[PDB]
């Protein structure tokens, strides 16, 4: 909730590696490209953008935010950021079959299995998986998320966020 | 961390709770003033994990309400997660006494350009839960405006997605 400032420099192709999305008259980070200027200043999926070059993003369309970034004079772009403000952590325990009890697609939880640790702990659907046991899984394929869950110990801590 | 709470039904057999199904969970939509619910610390936005040791996962609002109504005895147990969607934003009134938002039915509907609300990233389609620690769930819009108009310069609002 406490804002922080980041300075980006456009790469060789003139890009910062960011897709922004207008939600509820705010601006949120929808995509950070691996190894991008955005990635290197710590921008993450679900970050809220309060200011671009000291101008308020309030009520901006996705297009406007993107036009402002594209037209930005010179190499140096400032953003005022709230770090993943809607991020929440839930702890589950694997059952005798090694399952916590949820289905997901494209890193979004789609159903909760009856009588599972996910059910007991009130895990929610229409939430994106951000981290498993402190490991960032944004941008991983579903099979890679399953690989991490399958190799986990009994305790599974998942960081979630309401989906875009 | 969830907590377990014990409610004793009032003289009418009620706990003073309205529940809502969201994202295959169950959430507190209303806590009646001075109700058994109120007295064990339940608030708008609390998540209900268990009622009498049964998982609420995937229950309709109706089912949660039927289970509460059918509960035999003086004593109802719930497992509660404290307001997991709760977000607090601090704003400062401008020279005209405004923070810079419009709301309707306790729900923020627009952010005024160049306002404290704009600078602080206040969001629309969010319900106002508290103003400076005071609960405003169930208040009429004009009563919410009265509280904002009476506030000091510092306005801390607790919001939640609608
Ligand atoms: C992986 C765990 C979350 C496990 N759940 C599932 O296997 C169903 S979800 C899934 C979806 C796409 C792929 Cl590629 C792999 C798994 C559990 O409930 O513990
Ligand atoms: C009330 C505050 C939030 C103030 N905002 C407004 O005057 C516009 S919103 C409003 C809606 C319904 C009623 Cl009945 C009264 C006011 C501000 O921007 O500080």
Residue numbers in the entry:
A (entry chain C): 110 to 273
B (entry chain A): 111 to 272
From the paper:
The C58 inhibitor was selected for further investigations because it yielded the highest extinction of the HTRF signal. To validate and characterize the binding mode of the most potent compound C58 with its target protein, syntenin crystals were soaked with the compound. Moreover, co‐crystallization experiments indicated that C58 binds syntenin PDZ2 but not PDZ1 domain. C58 was further characterized in dose‐response HTRF assays testing syntenin‐SDC2 interaction and the IC50 was determined to be 350 µM. The binding of C58 to syntenin was also validated in surface plasmon resonance experiments (BIAcore) and in this experimental setting apparent KD values were determined to be 886 µM and 1026 µM for syntenin‐PDZ tandem plus C‐terminal domain and syntenin‐PDZ tandem (without C‐terminal domain) respectively. Consistent with the selectivity of C58 for syntenin, no binding could be observed in BIAcore between this compound and GRASP55‐PDZ tandem.
In contrast, SDC‐syntenin‐ALIX binding regulates the formation of endosomal intraluminal vesicles and the secretion of CD63+ exosomes that contain syntenin, C‐terminal fragments of the SDCs (SDC‐CTFs) and potential SDC‐cargo such as ligand‐engaged receptors (Baietti et al., 2012). Since syntenin activity strictly depends on the functionality of its PDZ domains (Baietti et al., 2012; Grootjans et al., 1997; Grootjans, Reekmans, Ceulemans, & David, 2000; Koo et al., 2002; Lambaerts et al., 2012; Luyten et al., 2008; Meerschaert et al., 2007; Zimmermann et al., 2002; Zimmermann et al., 2005; Zimmermann et al., 2001), we aimed to develop syntenin PDZ inhibitors and investigate their potential utility to control cellular phenotypes as well as exosomal‐releases.
